Amino acid sequence: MNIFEMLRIDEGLRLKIYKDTEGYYTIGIGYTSLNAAKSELDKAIGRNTNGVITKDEAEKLFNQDVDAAVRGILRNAKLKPVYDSLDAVRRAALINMVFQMGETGVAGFTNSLRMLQQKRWDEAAVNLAKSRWYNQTPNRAKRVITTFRTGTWDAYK
């Protein structure tokens, strides 16, 4: 088990485009005007695909984003610190975080972070949990949260 498998348990998977509730249209794995959408897939993958891609192209994308989540962590002065003090399992749940909402958005949880360095696990499991984040996605919110609190992937098996 690795971060990748994680987000794949977390983002479903689409071979065709999907408009969703806010107007976001997503494809492949955790990926973000329907024409403006199949006018970026055209640029992302490398071609015209009418909204459809293969699992390869879907995942190549995955790979793209993920590596990005990584970097957005280190370009940040607020995250890299908390990162370095986290272990593999805890660090990845952070990566599952940035992936989802991005560095800046996570950059908002200062309390929750200071709590994640002192290793106040529990407190950071209850702070993160009372959020617009959590309320909208309690299923994955909870998984990545358990992860932050235990130091194990028993939220993924």
As given in the structure block, the two tokens for residue 62 are 């995955």
Give the long-range contacts of residues 25-28, CB within 8 A, separation 24 or more.
27/51, 27/53, 27/58, 28/53, 28/57, 28/58, 28/59, 28/61, 28/62
Closest CA to 97 of 132, 140, 63: 140
**CA quadruple 18, 24, 30, 35: dihedral, nearest 10:** 60
DSSP 8-state symbol, 52: B
- Cβ atoms 89, 146 nearer than 8 A: no
Residue 148 is labelled as binding a ligand: no
Instruction: Please name which of 41, 65, 71 lies closest in space to residue 53, comparing C-alpha atoms.
Output: 41
Contacts of 88 (CB under 8 A, 6+ apart): none
Between CA 35 and CA 114 the distance in angstroms is 42
Q: Tokens in use for 60?
A: 């190549």
Find out whether 99 is annotated in a ligand binding site.
yes
Q: Resolution in angstroms for this experimental structure? A: 3.0
**Domains recognised in the chain with CATH numbers:** 1-157 (1.10.530.40)
Compute the distance between CA of residue 58 and CA of residue 97 in angstroms, rounded to an integer: 20
- CA dist 88 and 94 (Å) reads 10
In the chain, what's the furthest Cα-to-Cα distance?
50
Q: What angle do CA 140, 72, 54 make, to 5 degrees?
A: 60
Contact 136, 101 (CB under 8 A): no
User: How would you classify residue 51: left for phi > 0, otherwise alpha for psi between -120 and 50, otherwise beta?
Assistant: left
| H/E run at residue 37 | helix 34-37
Q: Which residue has the tokens 């492949």?
A: 28
| Helix, strand, coil in percent for the chain, rounding step 5 | 60, 5, 30
User: What was the elucidation method?
Assistant: X-ray
Rg (alpha carbons) of the chain, rounded to whole number: 16
How far is CA 69 from each of CA 134, 135, 157, rounded to the nearest angstrom?
A: 19, 22, 24
- Rounded distance between C-alpha atoms, residue 85 and residue 91, angstroms: 8
> Is position 112 annotated in a ligand binding site?
yes
Instruction: State the first-to-last Cα distance of the chain, in angstroms, to the nearest integer.
Output: 10
Broken C–N links (> 2.5 Å) in the chain, after residues: 32
Burial per residue of 125-140, b for 16 or more beta-carbon CB atoms within 10 angstroms, e otherwise: bebbbeeebeeeeeeb
Strand partners for 19: 25
Can you say whether the dihedral through the CA atoms of 31, 37, 43, 46 is positive or negative?
Answer: positive
Q: Which residues are catalytic?
A: 11, 20
